Amino acid sequence: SLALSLTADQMVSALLDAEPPILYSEYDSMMGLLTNLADRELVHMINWAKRVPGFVDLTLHDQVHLLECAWLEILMIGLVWRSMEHPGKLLFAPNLLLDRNQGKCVEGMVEIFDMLLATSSRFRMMNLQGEEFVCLKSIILLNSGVYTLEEKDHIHRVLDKITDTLIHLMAKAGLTLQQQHQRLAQLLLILSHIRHMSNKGMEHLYSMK
């Protein structure tokens, strides 16, 4: 309701202000390092989510459901974003940059690695902007578990706001109406690939438990 009243510029500002810090890898196996990082990022993700406009209007149940669905997607889109300036590498942390051949360390991970690298390459080719990135991350949070209805209606209105915000950003950058629609579509189709990679990652994680 407060979320539904924000201008596009205020939405951008709120999303940027909500951004968590970049964490350094720390030592307690490559999977051990990644698990350490992920579990620490999850704590920051909690407070990030609560700062995404509209999120805390939802019931506790709905907040848990959405985060439970989206968390690995959110980690992965973050990973891809920070690897953008590192062709052929994934920047897990400033002190943890891995190339593709290092992904073979964990039986199974190198399939996931190449997908993440192809997605980071796409971001680079599109010249994805930070303001666009924060919009996409918040869409993942609100969309991934959303089909499963007022609370869910409210979510759809917030989702529409974020779309409006993406278009505002593109228009401001001087894209024509046609370019704006094309780029909006290109960016949303990335979220299909992010879902895919999360599903594959979750499979890996569950099978080693």
Binding site: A38, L60, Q63, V64
Partner: peptide
């Protein structure tokens, strides 16, 4: 454990 349903519930309330 982190990322579990119960953990998310506890962290979000």
């Amino acid at each position: 454990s982190p990322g579990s349903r119960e953990w998310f519930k506890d962290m979000l309330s």
